Structure formats: C-alpha cells, structure tokens
C-alpha cells in the first residue's frame, strides 16, 4: 500500500468472512486460525511472486549484482584495477572517491557500457579514517560499490547483503590483483627469451609458476564451485518457487552457501590466503625492481621471500591437511583435489618451492 | 482550463523566456549590441528616453503583445558594473498578478543582467577582427600575445555561455515546461515555479556562499573591456610588458578558479559546477 | 541591427550551385517560386521583401557566360528574384577561361554591377557581409571574382567576406592548361581580399557523390545538391538561434586566429546518401561528431595531420535539434579521451560546440543536424600540390601566352612570382602553426 | 581500455585462415559485410572489440590486415561481400608480382624489401589501438611466399615493440602428402628459428591430420583447402570465445597462455576441438579428447619415449553443470588419461564459456583442448630429418643459391637446426622428472 500511494485482489470480503466465523466459534481453534493465516499468506505471497518475479525484473537485479557485484565483466574490472592502482597505492584523500568513480565510469564507457542507465547508478565508495575527517594506507584497501535498489526489491535488499557483497567483492578484486601482477611478471619474464637464461631468472620462473598454479587453481574453483551451483541453484528456486518467503529463503541459502564456499568464515584459511596474497605481491614487487636480470640483492630478496613461501606452503598443505581422516567441509575437499589434479603437491612432498635455488 | 484559455499564462511564461531569459535572440541581441556600440563610442547609453525607445522598437517587431510589457529605465567601479542596476519590467494582468510577484521581477532582472553582462563580454570579443587590429619584430610579437591571450579568453567566455545555456536555462526550462502542464492546481503551480526560479538563481551563482567565485570571473571579464579597447587602440597601447602582464593576471585567476571548483566538487557543494570544472580544464 | 547575406551568384557551377540553394531555402520554408510565401523561424534575414511584398532572395545573378542566367530564367525561379538582381553581361562568351581576362572584363562592367550592389547594400539596414559563391577552375570565374574581391575590399573594409570556391582537384590535370596559374591568382586574392574560405574539393564531392549515394556518375546536379544542403545547413543557425550564434561573427570568429589562416574545412552529417538510411533516427551526441570524424564524411579529400607538425586548431561542431548537456559532456571527454583532437603546438586547443535547435520545415534524416568546421592545417597538401603544378608549368614555360597576351601580363610575369610567394608563405605558415610563432 | 590485438593473414593459406575467421565472427555477432550489424544480434554480453574495432559509427570493422605476395588472392577477398566490412588501407597488395616462388629467403628479401611499406601501416594501425596487448599471426610456412615474410615480421615487431605479444597460428606443411616445393623443410626451418626467437607462442596447425581426418570424418577424398580452412576458422573461432564473451578467467590474451607457457622455451601447443564435424557431460567431451582420432594436429610418432602433457586446458561451450567436471575431474584421475610432469606442475583446468544465441547451436556442450605435450618435439625431428636428408642430398639448395643470401652461406640453416634439436632435446628431458633442474 505504502509504494501504491508513494494487494488483496478482491478476495478480502472471504477473508472477512473467514474472519467472521472464526469469531463466532465458542471454542477457539489454533489450528483453523493456523490454516486461515496460511491460505491468506499463500495468497498475499502469490502476489507478491507474480507482482516481482515477471513486472519487478528480479532476474534482472540479480544479474547485474553478478556482473558487478560479483565480477563477471573482466574487461570491465581489469581496466578499472589497472588504471586506478597508481592512486589506490597509497592511503586515499578526500578526493580518492571521485577520482576513482570517474575512472570507473570512463573505463566502463571505453569498455563499452554505453546501453546501461544504471551505470549513473553504479558508483563507488572509499572507507577511509583519514577519509572520515590502521587506517587504510591504500585505495585497494578499502573500497566498496554503491548500488541503488528501489520499491519493491529494496525490501529484500538488506544492508547485510550489501555488505556481504561488500566483502565478497573485497575478496575477488584482491585475487584479480594477484592474478594480474603474476600476468605482468610473466610477461616480463616472456621478454627475457630474447636473452640467455641465468640462475635467478630460473628461480623466478619456477616460484612464478608455482604461484601462477595456486592462484589458477584458486579462481578457477572460484568461478566454477563457489558460484555457478549457487546462482544455478537460486535461480532454479526462484524459477519453481511461488511465493515471497520461498524467494526470500532460496536467496538467503544462495548467498549462505556462496560465504561458506567463501572459506572467509575460517579463521586460519583466510589468514594463510591473506599470507599468500602478500607474499605474491612481494614477488612481482621484486621483480619489478630488476628490469633486467635480478642483482646480487634481488638473489637475496628472492632467497628470503623463497623460503617464506616454502613456509607458507607447508603452511596451507597442513591446513589444507587439518584433517583428511574425519568429516570435512566437501568444497574444500574439491579445492584441494583441484589442487592435486596429478597431487603435485604429495609430489612435491606437500609444500611448493621445496626446489634449490 | 479557464486561466489557461483566458489568461494566456503559456504565453506568459514564453514572453518570459524570450525576453528575461534570452530567446527573442535577435531583438535583445540587437538592442545590446546598440548598447555596446553606444558604450564603446563614449555614447548616451543611459539615456532613459534613449533606453525606452530603444526597447520599445526592439519589442514591437515581433511582440506588439510585449511592446508595452518591455520598458527600460535603467539609471545610474568596474566597465561591467556600469551595466549594474539595470531596469527592466513586465505586465502581470490580475489574477495573473498572484502568479508573478516583484521579488519575481527582480529575480528576472538579475538573470537577465547576468545574461547582458555575458553577452556584453561575448560582443566584445566577437565584434574585433584580426583585420581589424592588422590595419592599425616586437608589434608582431605582442600581436601575438594579443592573439593568446583573446583566444583563451574566447575560450573562457564560450564555456561560460554554453553553461549558461543548459546548465541553467535549457535543462531548467525544459523541466518548468513540461512540469508546469503536470500541475493542476494554482498552489502546485505557483510552487513548481518558485522552485524552478530559485534553480536558475542558484545555477546563476548568485548565492553569497559563491559570491568570491563570481567575482572572480567577471574581473578576468572585466579583463577583456580594456583588452577590446587595447585591441582597437592598435599596438601603440600596449607592449611586452602590457599584454604579459595581463596574461599572467588571467592565467593566476584561471589557476584560483581551476583550485576553487575542484575543492568545492571534491567538498560535494554542488553537483552543476563539475561542467564548469570541465569546461575550465577543458582546455 | 539585423542582419542580411548577399549572395553573389557567379561563374556557370556557382551560378548553378547558387540557384540550387536559393529554391532549397524557398522549398524548405514553403516558398513558392513566384516569390509568394505560404505556411523562432526567420525568413528574412536572407530574401528580402520588396515592395511587390515577395520574398526575393538577397542575391546578385552575374555571368559573363549567361547561358546559365537563360537556363535560370526559363525556370518558374525567375519570379522568385528581381530581373534587376540578375545582371546579365556577355563580352564574347566570357574571359575563355583566364584569369586575367575576366579580371579585365569585371573592370569593364565595374558600375554596371557595383551600382547593383551598393543598391541591395543601402536597401538592407544591416548586413551580415558578401558572399562570393563561384567556382575558380573556370578563368572567367577566377578573374571575376579576384576583381570583386578587390572592388569590395576597397569599398567595404567593414563587412564580412566569404567565398563559396569549388576548388578543382590540384593532384591532376585539369582541361585549363594556365589553371594552376588561375588558381594562385585567386588565392592571392583570397589570401589578401577575401576575409575567410571555406574549402570545397570539386575531385572530392564528385568522390563523395559516388560514395555516399553509389552512384557512378560525376553528376554535377548531384554536387550542387550536396553543396546546397551543405549551405542550407548553414543558414539554419542563423533562422534558430537557440541559445546563441544569431550572426555568422561568432560563428567565423571561433575559426580564424590569423586573418590569413581562416580557410576551413566542411563536413556535413546526414550527407545525402543512398547507402545510408535517410530517415529519421536517434543518435547520441558522441554519435554525431564520430560519424563525422570518417574522412568519407568530410567533403574534402585533404587529409588530418597527426604525424607531421599540423594539428587541428579548432573544431567548431554545430549540432541543432534536440540536446542534452551530459551527451554534451560525455562527447567532449570521451573525443579528447580518444585523442580526436589535437592542440596546436605551442599553446592548448580547445573543441567549440553550438547547442542549437532545428526548425521544423527543414527535411530531417536526423533529429539533430551536425556540422563540422575544421580549420586543422592538414589541408595544405592541395595548395602544395597546385604550387608544385604552377612551378612545373612556370619551369617549362607553358601557357603564359594567355597572359601575354594581356597587358597585365605583357609588363610581366612578376605577377605570377608574386602570387607563388604569396602561397608559399601560406604554406609556409600552415606548417609554422605548429609553432608560438607563426611566421 | 580494452586488450586490442590486431589480426596479420599471411600467404595463401593464412590469409584464406583470416578470411573465414572474420566471416565466422560476423556470424557470431550478426555482422552483416560492409561494417553493417543487425540490431537483434547486438543485445548480447559478446564483446567488438578486441578482433573488431569501434569505428566512428559503432559498426565493428575488423582489425585485419591482408598481406601476400600473391595479389591473386588480395583480388579475390576482395570480391568477396566482406570485402566492405575490412578496412581497405589496412589491406596490402603484393607489388612485386612473382613474390618469392614459395621460399624462405625470397620471402624474407621481399619482406625485407618492404619494411617500410608495411611498418608504416602496421604503426598507423596500432596507434589507432588502445591497450594493444599483441599480434596474432594467421599464416603458412609453408608457401615460402608467406614463410619468409612472416619471418622478416616477426623479428621487425620483436624489434619495435617491447611489450606487444607474438601470437602465431603457424599452419604446418603436410607431411601425409609431399609436394613439388622441397625446400619446405628448408624454408619452415627457417621461420622456426625466428619462431623459435621471434615468437612468443606458436600455435601448431598440420595439415597431414586435418587431411587425414578430412579424408574419413568428412569422407571428402580431395584435399582441398576450403574444407581445412573451414574447420580451421571453425576451431578458432571456438578458441576466440572467452576473449568475446564476458567472463571472471581467460578475458585477456596474455591470461591465456600464461598458464600454458611455464617455460619461455616451452611455447609449442596443439589444440583440439569436440564435437568433430562428421559428415552428453564432460567425460565423454574429454574422452573424446583424448582419443587421439579427435586430434586435430599430427602427434608424437613415438609412444615408447612417454611423452607427457605438459599443460592441459579446456574450454566448453554451452551447457554448464558443475558436477560435470567434478567427476571428470575424478575420472581424469582414475582412468589416468592425462599425463603430468613430475619436475612442475600439470593439473587440469577447465573453463565454462557460452554459445553464441545468435546462431543455431548443434551441441549443448562444445569441449576444445589446449595441450602444451611433448609428442609435438618427433614433429620437429620429422621436419628435421626431412630437412637433413634434404641436406644430406646437397641438391635443390642451388635454389637459395639464387639469392646471395643463402649463397653466401647456409649458416643460418645450420644455427635453425641446431636450435630445434636444442628443442626437441629439451622437449624429451621434459619427460623426465629432472627439468627443473636445467
């Protein structure tokens, strides 16, 4: 009624009819109030379906929360980060957010998002102490999508979800940052055919590979397992369902399941996945530091960064390994048979960089 | 329907466009450019009689309707503040007069002033010729530093008429247009276009929280007067030092101004001066 | 005070292109040919109504071959002007196609059409200037309107000079064996008496002909249309003023920062075009000024330059018809983020855009009307082409007969020696714009 | 700021390749010829600009260049429909006329010759481009004509550009049916060499299996190009998919080779497709795959030496059900189908990609293979003892003693050979879990 001005049909005088003899019972029936309640739930629930499923474009939300809120546009999000990582580098300003929407929003003009009106909807948001006036001492460190939802779907949308994609979204920028500094490092390391092979850039090329394995390994699981059963598995629920709550419901199991394949739930994962981040960033950044050949230092800085990855690595296979003989979450049992699609890592004695410098 | 069909208020509203807001293009156009022609000859411009008859022979060519409504009397620091307090009235027939208020009529003044002024600084550019300038080393040189220092000024003027033009007069009056048909009642109406008339005055800059902004501008307009003047005057008005130092000045104000709105946009003051931003860092 | 154009109607395909334009404007505003008129717009600012209250247009009809002005004539469009507006003068079958020769022959009937002009010049309150519409290929053409440029120039130093030249292509021969010689003279006088030219390759309209409506004939009716949808857009500003631009000053003004270098070119879009639909359809505005962009939308076979040292200096795009500031906006940021434009080397450029709206008796292809004047020096390759043929032909001594045989000439050749230097220190500052300093 | 990478047919065979990728991809995108695109094939998520560029009308004229020396075929694309839609300067006509006769060193010396001509188009292209990650050469090294200007360019853009990737769809000679060019060994030898230095990574394409598999699946006796050439565009159109539809993986073309590309030496990959033009889950896609019938190139001649996949991926179209590739996964696993490298990592991954809704599917599930394995390196030895009793006979090189080039010396022929052993040599230790170790 409240978007009507800014529902029953016309079956309100059975309601009230319904009501009426409920009233004139001399003993009270819980169960008839039940059943009364739930035919009319059905009812307000079958219009509130038909009044969103085909007239309120609920797909439609949902694809584009996919495509953005959830990636889906590579094009799209891979020239945003590269563009907009010489000013996220460092802790953002009060002028970040605009600087950043405006690159967004001309990447997504030069990468051809010209049909969507919803690209001036389409905005972004630093978080930020000094932003506000450990802080955020980047603008990847802290970013999040403003999105706006309107009547009636605004009502599903809460803030929580918006923050779970927040965090998703958080999660999945950080693992395509990795995937295009590993990209660019073995680009770089694809120019040095012109060149003879030295010790150091054969070390460089086995961790490159190493980690150019994880991370594949990672997002490939990413893309499929965390999220095509999820959103295969919604749509299928909203396709059958009939009613407000089923939606509501199915929805909530999607994204339930979509955070648990998240695995940031597990404490430990998530602090070796930020390990792993960091020490892949570390390697590119050192890489960077040598156009050529790496230097007596750059040996050094690879030896040290070499060995906390072996480290690491032990790390994840044992956590990885926290326990194969009793019950264990099933999708990661699939990440780790992913990982050991020949078990290169029982090959490899359980750890990556095991190998000589 | 019976003030619509009786009182004309459709016409009312496009004789108020025409004249306060700059579309009757060729008569005001005409009347100003005698305006300036008038100011730059040391002519009578003042002249209240000379104003009257100027405006009645302006409007009656194409609005003998607004031949009455139109009439100048304007009477009177900087070469634009001589354009200041000018005077311009309208006539709101009763019960159209609940409609239109004074506070209107003065509102209208100062957008139509603003309007006057710009296209005071737009003739000025506009009416020297390169030939001009060429029929009257270092006189080639400061020729060429005269020609720098117009083209950035045309460039500075262009953008502020075409901010003129949509961001507060077309997109403004487009939406009264159709928003006025919307509204049914008198009170709807009266308070769609008291909010369309405070749009175009703030889109006019003329709140005092920006008042500094404005006066920035129009001293770079002030700037061109004497540039026009210079320009007639041949090169034996001006030198190196002359033009440079003049350039300078406009190239410290466009810097304070290119400063000034990104702070302010970067501020969230208003969302209408990013165009400006845009137009200033345009080129 | 108001404005008024002049048209001055002159050689055959000027003539032709002349009388083509004025029954378009007369056709688009419902004019019937007999001067009489039936149903802000205005159509008076280029006719004017005489005393048999008709709508004659502002133009002066002159041939020195008048087999164009018969072929006007026998077309009910004689009514439409005055029999005194065409003047017709016949010397022996016009200059034979030399520069000098028509020079000569517009000397000769000086008052007979100069007391014509300052007649329409006193009959008109203000005006917008004289417009020389002409093609320089034919000698006739090129002296006569050298002669007028000059004639003018003495007697209205005051008022806008335009010329509407159909430049045949310097990259070949043409029938003209002193043509190159006809051409440097008439572009001395542009250069010195013409105010500002608007370029119009005749090799690249019978091209753009051929394109855009496959066609496979050079049809000169087919170029006289182009030319007159091309000058009919024009005048369309100057019926609409929209926000502003109620002169063609402001308009021409953007386009000249050297009272030498204001030669512009032309491009016009919906082109008529038989391989492109010609209805009404929407487009954004980036649609507008990147269809433009393709050199097959540019009337013009020169070229852009963004490899050697010439970049364009303006870009006056004039879009009429419905506007939207962020299409606008969005234009402008994403032409310079494409690097559409270029600055002039040593000091910013800037994109000039007209936010104008149509009137509702021009045929529309398009909600909006967009017109491009690029004064982008990459357009001297033509001037350097007919340099290089007049310095070939001056080496090899040919066709200075047909200028000998004028005492002119007779004194000397120095005339011709003046005007290639004239060009080269045109070119010369073509390629010098890229410079803070333009000689 | 897309990834831009302009497309180079070469030869007879290359540009014949060039030329059915583009009507491939129009019909994918409903590109009608002369830069047209109809309206109810463009409300799609597929992607005009990477093999496509955005004119100034928004029509998708092809980033295509057309270079031969043989101007027969430039005359007949150019009668072809399509002809309209490319880019007309991009196009480059072979002035010389009689070309290099199909050699090596002819090739090279025309190209050579024509550096700038082609240099200067090359550039007006690129600059046109926005984020150019690299060039794709479509070509033959086997017509010599394409061979040694493919050659010549390969190390002109090695030379100018530092970052721009070398992509090469190398269409190999036929080695089921010899012809009279017997300096094919020689000349492709050649071009390995600079396909050894000069390329970043090379896609092999035999004609000896596409004729084979022409001859039976197809049950066409001729081996004609025209039906090569279709299953050729065919299976790189499919190969284009992930760069023109949108997706979370595999969106750019250096993420496409960088998991099949470990070492910079490593670079040689063959390629699959399934369903096989003859004239379901993902087990059967893959083993499909895996039957060798299925291979579209020519494969290791010699199973006692174990070759091993080195890199495997798989990309499918349409119908995508996650269970699918779990159990293939473990199917992989337990049937032991795939071979791995000890020394580094061999795993198995596979992309989900779409189907075009704006042409008529034929298979709910379309599975291509990229494997990077070391039976391709017995190809090489059969190029290069193909080359070495052509050596051995010391006849026919009188043929390269025509241009000084090769009369001079033959040097660079031996330095070619040499470098393929190298590779084969490196290709066999591969097999052994010891590769790290050089």
């Known amino acids: 009624e409240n978007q009507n001005v800014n529902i029953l049909k016309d079956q309100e005088d059975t309601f009230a009819a319904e009501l009426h003899r409920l009233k004139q019972q001399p003993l009270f029936s819980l169960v008839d109030f039940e059943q009364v309640v739930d035919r009319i739930r059905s009812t307000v629930a079958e219009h509130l379906w038909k009044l969103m499923v085909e007239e309120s474009d609920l797909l439609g939300q949902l694809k584009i929360i996919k495509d953005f809120y959830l990636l889906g546009r590579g094009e799209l999000f891979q020239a945003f980060i590269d563009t907009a990582q010489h000013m996220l580098k460092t802790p953002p300003t009060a002028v970040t957010e605009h600087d950043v929407n405006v690159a967004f929003q001309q990447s997504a003009h030069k990468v051809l998002l010209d049909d969507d009106n919803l690209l001036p909807l389409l905005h972004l948001t630093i978080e930020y102490h000094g932003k506000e006036h450990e802080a955020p001492a980047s603008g990847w460190a802290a970013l999040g999508l403003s999105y706006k939802v309107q009547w009636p779907l605004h009502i599903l949308f809460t803030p929580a979800v918006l923050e779970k994609y927040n965090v998703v979204f958080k999660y999945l920028l950080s693992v395509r940052r990795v995937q295009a500094e590993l990209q660019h490092c073995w680009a770089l390391q694809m120019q040095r055919k012109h060149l003879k092979s030295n010790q150091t850039d054969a070390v460089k090329w086995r961790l490159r590979n190493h980690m150019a394995f994880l991370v594949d390994n990672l997002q490939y699981y990413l893309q499929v397992d965390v999220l095509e059963s999820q959103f295969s598995q919604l749509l299928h629920q909203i396709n059958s369902t009939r009613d407000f709550e089923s939606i509501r419901l199915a929805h909530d199991h999607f994204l339930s399941n979509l955070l648990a394949q998240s695995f940031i739930l597990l404490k430990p994962v998530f602090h070796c996945l930020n390990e792993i981040l960091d020490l892949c960033h570390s390697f590119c950044s050192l890489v960077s530091q040598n156009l050529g050949p790496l230097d007596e230092r750059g040996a050094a800085q690879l030896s040290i960064l070499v060995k906390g990855f072996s480290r690491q690595s032990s790390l994840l296979f044992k956590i990885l390994s926290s326990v194969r003989n009793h019950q264990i979450n099933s999708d990661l049992a699939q990440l780790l048979l992913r990982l050991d699609y020949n078990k290169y890592y029982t090959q490899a004695g359980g750890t990556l960089g095991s190998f000589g410098m | 329907r019976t003030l619509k069909k009786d009182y004309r208020l459709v016409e009312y509203l496009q004789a108020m466009r025409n004249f306060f807001l700059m579309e009757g293009g060729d008569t005001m156009y005409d009347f100003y450019t005698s305006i300036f022609d008038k100011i730059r000859e040391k002519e009578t411009w003042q002249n209240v009689s000379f104003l009257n008859v100027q405006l009645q022979e302006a409007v009656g060519q194409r609005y003998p309707e607004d031949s009455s409504r139109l009439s100048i009397s304007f009477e009177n620091k900087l070469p634009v503040h001589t354009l200041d307090g000018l005077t311009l009235s309208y006539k709101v027939p009763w019960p159209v007069d609940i409609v239109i208020s004074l506070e209107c009529q003065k509102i209208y003044n100062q957008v139509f002033l603003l309007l006057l002024q710009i296209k005071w600084a737009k003739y000025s550019l506009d009416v020297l010729l390169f030939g001009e300038l060429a029929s009257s080393e270092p006189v080639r040189q400061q020729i060429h530093r005269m020609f720098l220092l117009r083209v950035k000024l045309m460039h500075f003027v262009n953008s502020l008429h075409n901010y003129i033009m949509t961001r507060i007069l077309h997109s403004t009056g487009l939406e009264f247009q159709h928003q006025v048909e919307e509204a049914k009642d008198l009170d709807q109406l009266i308070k769609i276009h008291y909010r369309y008339l405070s749009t175009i005055h703030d889109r006019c800059l003329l709140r005092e929280k920006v008042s500094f902004v404005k006066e920035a501008i129009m001293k770079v307009l002030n700037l061109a007067l004497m540039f026009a003047d210079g320009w007639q005057a041949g090169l034996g008005a001006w030198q190196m030092e002359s033009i440079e130092k003049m350039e300078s000045d406009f190239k410290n104000c466009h810097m304070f101004l290119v400063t000034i709105l990104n702070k302010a946009v970067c501020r969230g003051s208003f969302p209408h001066l990013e165009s400006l931003a845009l137009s200033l860092m345009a080129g | ?439």
């Open chain 3, 1 to 439: 005070m108001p404005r008024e154009i002049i048209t001055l109607q002159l050689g055959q395909c000027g003539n032709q292109i002349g009388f083509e334009f004025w029954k378009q404007l007369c056709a688009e505003h419902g004019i019937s040919p007999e001067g009489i008129v039936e149903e802000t717009d205005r159509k008076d600012v280029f006719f004017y109504q005489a005393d048999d209250e008709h709508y004659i247009p502002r133009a002066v009809l002159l041939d020195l071959e008048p087999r164009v002005i018969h072929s006007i004539l026998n077309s009910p469009y004689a009514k439409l002007y005055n029999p005194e507006n065409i003047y017709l003068s016949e010397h022996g079958g016009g200059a034979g196609n030399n520069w000098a020769s028509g020079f000569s022959q517009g000397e000769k009937i000086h008052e007979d059409i100069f007391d014509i002009i300052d007649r329409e010049a006193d009959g008109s309150d203000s005006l917008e200037g004289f417009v020389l519409c002409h093609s320089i290929a034919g000698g006739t053409g090129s002296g006569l309107g050298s002669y007028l440029l000059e004639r003018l120039n003495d007697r209205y130093p005051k008022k806008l000079v335009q010329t509407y030249s159909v430049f045949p292509n310097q990259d070949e021969m043409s029938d003209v064996v002193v043509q190159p010689y006809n051409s440097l003279l008439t572009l001395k006088r542009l250069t010195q008496n013409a105010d500002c030219v608007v370029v119009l390759d005749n090799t690249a309209l019978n091209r753009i002909a051929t394109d855009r409506l496959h066609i496979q004939n050079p049809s000169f009716s087919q170029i006289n249309q182009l030319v007159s949808t091309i000058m009919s857009a024009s005048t369309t500003t100057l019926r609409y003023p929209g926000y502003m631009n109620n002169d063609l000053i402001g308009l021409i003004a953007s386009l000249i920062p050297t009272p030498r270098l204001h030669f512009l070119m032309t491009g016009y879009t919906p082109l008529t075009t038989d391989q492109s639909v010609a209805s009404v359809r929407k487009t954004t505005v980036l649609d507008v000024m990147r269809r433009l962009l393709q050199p097959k939308n540019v009337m013009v076979s020169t070229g852009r330059d963004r490899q050697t040292n010439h970049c364009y200096i303006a870009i006056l795009n004039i879009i009429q018809g419905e506007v939207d500031p962020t299409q606008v906006h969005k234009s402008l940021q994403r032409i310079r983020e494409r690097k559409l434009a270029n600055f002039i080397p040593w000091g910013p450029a800037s994109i000039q855009v007209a936010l104008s709206r149509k009137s509702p008796y021009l045929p529309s292809a398009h909600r909006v009307s967009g017109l491009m004047m690029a004064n982008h020096t990459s357009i001297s390759s033509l001037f350097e082409s007919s340099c290089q043929q007049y310095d070939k032909l001056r080496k090899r001594e040919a066709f200075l007969e047909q200028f000998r045989k004028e005492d002119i000439f007779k004194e000397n050749f120095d005339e011709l020696d003046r005007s290639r230097e004239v060009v080269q220190e045109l070119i010369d500052e073509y390629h010098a714009a890229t410079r803070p300093d333009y000689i």
